[PDB]
Amino acid sequence: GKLPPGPTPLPFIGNYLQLNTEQMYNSLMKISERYGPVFTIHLGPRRVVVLCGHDAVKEALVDQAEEFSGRGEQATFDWLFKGYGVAFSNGERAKQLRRFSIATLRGFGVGKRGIEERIQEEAGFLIDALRGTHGANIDPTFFLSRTVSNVISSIVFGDRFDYEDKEFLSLLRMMLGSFQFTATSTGQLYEMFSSVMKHLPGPQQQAFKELQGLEDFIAKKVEHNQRTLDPNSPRDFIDSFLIRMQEEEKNPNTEFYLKNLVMTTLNLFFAGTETVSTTLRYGFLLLMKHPEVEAKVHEEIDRVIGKNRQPKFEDRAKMPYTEAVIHEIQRFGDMLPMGLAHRVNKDTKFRDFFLPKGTEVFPMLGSVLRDPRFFSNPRDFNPQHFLDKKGQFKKSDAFVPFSIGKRYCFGEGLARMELFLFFTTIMQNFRFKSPQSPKDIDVSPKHVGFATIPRNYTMSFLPR
Numbered sequence: 001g002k003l004p005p006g007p008t009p010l011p012f013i014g015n016y017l018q019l020n021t022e023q024m025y026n027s028l029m030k031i032s033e034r035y036g037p038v039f040t041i042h043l044g045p046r047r048v049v050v051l052c053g054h055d056a057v058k059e060a061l062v063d064q065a066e067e068f069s070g071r072g073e074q075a076t077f078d079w080l081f082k083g084y085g086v087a088f089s090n091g092e093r094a095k096q097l098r099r100f101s102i103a104t105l106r107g108f109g110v111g112k113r114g115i116e117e118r119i120q121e122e123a124g125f126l127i128d129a130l131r132g133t134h135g136a137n138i139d140p141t142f143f144l145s146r147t148v149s150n151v152i153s154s155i156v157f158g159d160r161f162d163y164e165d166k167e168f169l170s171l172l173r174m175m176l177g178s179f180q181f182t183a184t185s186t187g188q189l190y191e192m193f194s195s196v197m198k199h200l201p202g203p204q205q206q207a208f209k210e211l212q213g214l215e216d217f218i219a220k221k222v223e224h225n226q227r228t229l230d231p232n233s234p235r236d237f238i239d240s241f242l243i244r245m246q247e248e249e250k251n252p253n254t255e256f257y258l259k260n261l262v263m264t265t266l267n268l269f270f271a272g273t274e275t276v277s278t279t280l281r282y283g284f285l286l287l288m289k290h291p292e293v294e295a296k297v298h299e300e301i302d303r304v305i306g307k308n309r310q311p312k313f314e315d316r317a318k319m320p321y322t323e324a325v326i327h328e329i330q331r332f333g334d335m336l337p338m339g340l341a342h343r344v345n346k347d348t349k350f351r352d353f354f355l356p357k358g359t360e361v362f363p364m365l366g367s368v369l370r371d372p373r374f375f376s377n378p379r380d381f382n383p384q385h386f387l388d389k390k391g392q393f394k395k396s397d398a399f400v401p402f403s404i405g406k407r408y409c410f411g412e413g414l415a416r417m418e419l420f421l422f423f424t425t426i427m428q429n430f431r432f433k434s435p436q437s438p439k440d441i442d443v444s445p446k447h448v449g450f451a452t453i454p455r456n457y458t459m460s461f462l463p464r
């Protein structure tokens, strides 16, 4: 009959006094130690029920999947999305957009054997660009992002970008900056205080222009497809969506119309770029700091695949150690520490608590990736976390970086394959050197907010 207990809030500022916007995850975790694994917090005027640990997150998003499947808010993005598109929508809109996106994506080979050649081909170009650096110290950021991005770009636009295309880099800076903004102290103040801050000068204004620039580029690309549309030969995700829009022109209550097309396409292009990219970046830093772990990956690539042929997704089954390393890089990297907010569809009873309809919910995936009964050394980089006695791959019920339940990341299939093919191909060809001794390397995060951003760094790609 009652809400989950929590610290007393003040009018408008909510629980701003018990929260440090530079490290929200730590704040919310401190409050958990006092109040328990399920609690109520006020992010400014927003009432949020917070879930910590494997159990409370699973009992909500799995055992009570339908009730907890609404989408909560993410102030910075909502500035742009305003409830349109697959990722920021609710109800019938979310369900039609999701069901359309998963089937259309699957049809383009995504998550099946079909997108595979295209990932091997794009790995190949990156190896080439990496030879082109001659072993210099470089910031790997945009090298990796061009590559990852071209995979989803093919799928939604129809072709990859040239690596030297200047607009491309521009787009890549718009993504990086706006995503990175949500990880900052001001980006977290924005979650609490968007009603005033959207009208105030600050880094938020940069993030908006960057988003608006990403929306404008998508709208332009859609006009191009629209005035060259062959329904009997869809080139890409946008064409498919436009074809379904044609089919649904005589339904006045359809979710399939321009704004949703533009917003869904952005959702896929932005998420299909930024997360995998950052995960690669984080992981190459984790590997230079754990050279012995790098070297056991090497041993597997060398024994199982060798130096001549391209790696393939099927090789994973005989590479338990690489697979554990990628898993443990995703775990340690904790890309979305509070996932995407949810909300409850209706009046919901959850363990003795009552949650009124529309109550926001933070599933704290970071606290699942660090739950001390599922991982022996949660705050350490330890690949043994996903390995048994024998050295065979050991799955974990608490490996939840793509979230779980009805709104789980349907990019998961693409990501798993991109990470696997991108790590093995890169490391088949190059071992890594930083201008720092392993002891000096700081793998603690630069920013922690909506996302976990690794620190700035440089490295060299040295042929093996």
Ligand code: HEM
Residues within 6 Å of the ligand: 071, 086, 087, 088, 089, 098, 152, 267, 268, 271, 272, 273, 275, 276, 279, 335, 336, 339, 340, 341, 365, 401, 402, 403, 404, 406, 407, 408, 409, 410, 411, 412, 414, 415
């Ligand atoms: C390692 C890389 C990735 C991570 C860690 C990740 C993580 C997540 C997480 C935690 C969510 C929230 C699920 C929830 O609301 O409970 C999500 C949603 C989503 N992700 Fe990803 N993702 C990754 C890659 C991708 C890729 C490659 C795509 C493109 C296909 C993508 C597209 C989406 C979309 C469209 C949603 C919204 C789902 C919905 O609202 O129904 N993600 N992702």
Ligand SMILES: CN(CCCC(=O)c1cccnc1)N=O
Residues within 6 Å of the ligand: 077, 087, 266, 267, 268, 270, 271, 272, 274, 275, 340, 409, 411
């Ligand atoms: C990047 N991450 C999703 C973050 C929220 C999201 O899905 C999103 C955010 C901005 C634009 N498009 C999608 N998913 O992999």
